[PDB]
Structures are given as structure tokens and as C-alpha cells.
């Protein structure tokens, strides 16, 4: 229909005409190529649709209006705001209790789009009381009671209530949602698992107290299991959540190790999916920033050759993540752990990466080389290391960096030349 024909039917004194026009609006807003959301907004139709959500008698017009509003709220922030400004948040929360599962599901979906817009609308959905009726829909002993698409919508909408920063979701809300999240994290549906992992990944990004809340729930072993799933949509958020947890305290990081996560990293650090391999390298960088006994577990799982491999060949951003992982290792490791890096072949790929002109990565590499030399000094191995650096062309690079423009680069390279190559 044209928008005029929709307005005429919506503004008739005939309810069947109103349902027909609302249906035509829902189809127009669902069409593949550029649905006319703004023309529908300018026509003043959102208040009519919100009014229809309250027509408990005429469930077909409730469903059609909920679908039409869902697809407006799927748009820009300004389009989502027009839906909120029409009073839709409390009207959708009221619809969660509908005896018709497909209408309740549509309200869940719309609330997910609204909360997904950002932290202010997320917190406004929470303030209107959406969490209690949403969790009540999931408070059954067997989750396979519920339709698969229904369960996926509830999980996704809950994940958007856990999402976003500045500010993070209210503590009381996260505490109330978490136990249901833990159940969904064990449910045997791939999309439910994926969005459960996304929710946990959101909750674990922040101050270490936020990590602690999640880890206290016993979730890390299941996250490590999902780390090994064959579905990339599951591995991606599972690895994100694990990566967030190891940015925390040493004890939080130890829970990831004790659950067996390191055994998965030979595959993760060679994964052909670029973002998986890069985030696994970042995760290793925060583990090698841990205790010496945690570095030793990296060693024991055979992961140092894999970090040598990533540094040797990967896309440039990933190689730089690996350089950070190495510099952290050399900053906190024992002398024995550090010279083991050299035995595994770290020097040549470090010197190869020093061809980069970026001031930032140069300093990272020079710091790692300085830390390795300091360990070699305690063992009496500096001459071996110097020969190794010269033979792969690394001395040429260092020597030329004595004339770099940046003072931090120029003084670090001078210092290496004076101490070890005179």
C-alpha cells in the first residue's frame, strides 16, 4: 500500500479496516529494500500502533502492530527513539504476559531492539520493569518446554540488557539476570549458546569486580568447553569471554587455566579465521602478563612455539598482538623461561618485525630484546645472543635506529649497541 492508504484505513471507524491497514504497514516495513520508516513516522502512525498493543480483544492487531513497531525500532537511534517516545516500552512489557506465545515473543523482540540501541534505553527498559516478566517466561524446569525461536529471542533480548558501557548495567539487574544466563549457557541450541556467551562476554568486560560476579557462578568450565565448539558463532563469544576473564586478577586468570583452556590454544593460535587467531593471541598476552607459574603453564602446554609461529607469519595486526604477548612474557618470566623463548626461535621473527616503521611497535620489540639480553647476562649467554641478532640482519636494523627521529627509540637502540655490540 501507499502510506496514504494505510493512514486512511488506520483512521477509519472500522476495526477490520484498521487491522487490514496495520497489516499493510507491517508488510511495507518488512520489505527488503529501504522500507519507508520515516514516512510512516511522519504520518503519525506510532501512537496508533502503540494504542493497538493494548487491544486485548483483537489479538491480530496486537501482533501486527507489535511487528510493525519492532521493525521501526530495528532502525536508527532516532527511529528507535520515536518508538520509545510513543510510549511503547510499558505497552510491550504489558504484552509479555499475553496468552498468545507469538505475541509475547514479538514483545520480547521489540524490547531487545529498544535495549540494543544503547545504555540509556537499556536502563530505561530495566526501569519500566522488564526483567521480572522476561525471567518469568524462562522459569520452567525444562527449557525444551519452550519453542526454539521463542527461547532464542528471550536469550538475545536478555543479552542486550547485559550489554554496553558508560554505564554498565545496574548491579542489581545483573545479579537478577545471571542465574538464568547460567542455565541458558548449558542449553543445547547453538544460537542460545552463542547469545548466552555474548551476554557473559559483555558482563566480563570492565572492573575486576564485574569479572568476579560471573566467575563466582562457576561458568568458566562451560566457557572452555564452548571454546572448542565447531560453530564459529559460538567460539567467537566464548573466546571473547575467556579473554575478558584473563584481564582480571591472577586468581581469576588461574580459573581459566585450571579449567583446561590452554589445551585449546594450539588450534586457536592457528585458526584460519583471522579474528579468532588475533583474539587468541591477545588472550595469551594477558596470560603471559600473569604470574611466573602461569607462564610456566604456557610453557608446559607447548604454546611458546605457537607464539613464535604467530610472530613469524600472520597478518600485521596479529603479529603486533604477538609482539605484546612476548614483551609481557619477557617482563615477568624467570631467566629460565626467557632463554627458553630464544631456544624456541623468537629472535629471528622479532628482528624481522623491526622493519616496521611504526614508532609504537619498535619500542615494544626493543623492550623485549632488552629484557632477553638481561636474562642472557645472568646466564652468561650475551655473546650467543649477539651473534644470533647479527646473523639474521637484526644488528643492521638496531644500528640504524640509533638515528631514528624519536628519542625513546634512539636511546634504546644506542644502549643495546653500547652494551652488547661493541
Amino acid at each position: 500500500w501507499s502510506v496514504e492508504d494505510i493512514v486512511k484505513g488506520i483512521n477509519s471507524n472500522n476495526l477490520e479496516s484498521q487491522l487490514q491497514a496495520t497489516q499493510a504497514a507491517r508488510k511495507l516495513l518488512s520489505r527488503e529494500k529501504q522500507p519507508p520508516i520515516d514516512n510512516i513516522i511522519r504520518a503519525g502512525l506510532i501512537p496508533k500502533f502503540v494504542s493497538f498493543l493494548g487491544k486485548t480483544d483483537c489479538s491480530p492487531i496486537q501482533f501486527e502492530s507489535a511487528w510493525a513497531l519492532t521493525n521501526i525500532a530495528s532502525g536508527t537511534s532516532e527511529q528507535t527513539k520515536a518508538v520509545v517516545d510513543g510510549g511503547a516500552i510499558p505497552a510491550f512489557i504489558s504484552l509479555l504476559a499475553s496468552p498468545h506465545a507469538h505475541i509475547s515473543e514479538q514483545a520480547v523482540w521489540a524490547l531487545g531492539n529498544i535495549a540494543g540501541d544503547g545504555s540509556a534505553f537499556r536502563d530505561l527498559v530495566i526501569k519500566h520493569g522488564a526483567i521480572d516478566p522476561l525471567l518469568a517466561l524462562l522459569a520452567v524446569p525444562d527449557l525444551s518446554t519452550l519453542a526454539c525461536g521463542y527461547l532464542r529471542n528471550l536469550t538475545w533480548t536478555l543479552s542486550n540488557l547485559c550489554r554496553n558501557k558508560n554505564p554498565a548495567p545496574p548491579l542489581d539487574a545483573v545479579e537478577q539476570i545471571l542465574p538464568t544466563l547460567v542455565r541458558l549457557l548449558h542449553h543445547n541450541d547453538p544460537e542460545v549458546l552463542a547469545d548466552s556467551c555474548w551476554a557473559i562476554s559483555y558482563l566480563t568486560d570492565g572492573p575486576n569486580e564485574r569479572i568476579e560476579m560471573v566467575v563466582k557462578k562457576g561458568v568458566v568450565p562451560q566457557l572452555v568447553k564452548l571454546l572448542g565448539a565447531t560453530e564459529l558463532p559460538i567460539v567467537t563469544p566464548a573466546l571473547r569471554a575467556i579473554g575478558n576473564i584473563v584481564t582480571g586478577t591472577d586468581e581469576q586468570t588461574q580459573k581459566v587455566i585450571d579449567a583446561g583452556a590452554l589445551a585449546v590454544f594450539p588450534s586457536l593460535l592457528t585458526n584460519p579465521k583471522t579474528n579468532i587467531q588475533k583474539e587468541a593471541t591477545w588472550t595469551m598476552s594477558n596470560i603471559t602478563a600473569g604470574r611466573q607459574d602461569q607462564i610456566q603453564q604456557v610453557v608446559n602446554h607447548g604454546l611458546v612455539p605457537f607464539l613464535v609461529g604467530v610472530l613469524s607469519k600472520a597478518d600485521f595486526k596479529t603479529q603486533k598482538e604477538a609482539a605484546w604477548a612476548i614483551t609481557n612474557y619477557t617482563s615477568g618470566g624467570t631467566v629460565e623461561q626467557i632463554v627458553y623463548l630464544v631456544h624456541c626461535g623468537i629472535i629471528e621473527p622479532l628482528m624481522n618485525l623491526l622493519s616496521a616503521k611504526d614508532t609504537k611497535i619498535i619500542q615494544v620489540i626493543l623492550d623485549a630484546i632488552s629484557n632477553i639480553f638481561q636474562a642472557a647476562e645472568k646466564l652468561g649467554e650475551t655473546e650467543k645472543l649477539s651473534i644470533m641478532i647479527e646473523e639474521c640482519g637484526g644488528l643492521d636494523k638496531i644500528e640504524a635506529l640509533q638515528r631514528h627521529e624519536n628519542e625513546s627509540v634512539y636511546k634504546a637502540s644506542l644502549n643495546l649497541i653500547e652494551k652488547y655490540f661493541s
Binding site: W109, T247, W324
Partner: peptide, 26 residues
């Protein structure tokens, strides 16, 4: 020191994966 996701995202965006934010019903 540990480095949080915000710093990884500043190094690596755009394209760092995230869950679906909004969904259109077809």
C-alpha cells in the same frame, strides 16, 4: 600489567566482532 578489551578494540576496530544489536523481522 593486564590490558582490557577497550585497548584491544582501539588497536583493532573497525571489525571487532560483537553480537547482533538490532534485528528486523522478515
Amino acid at each position: 600489567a593486564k590490558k582490557k578489551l577497550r585497548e584491544y578494540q582501539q588497536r583493532n576496530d573497525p571489525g571487532v566482532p560483537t553480537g547482533a544489536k538490532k534485528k528486523k523481522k522478515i
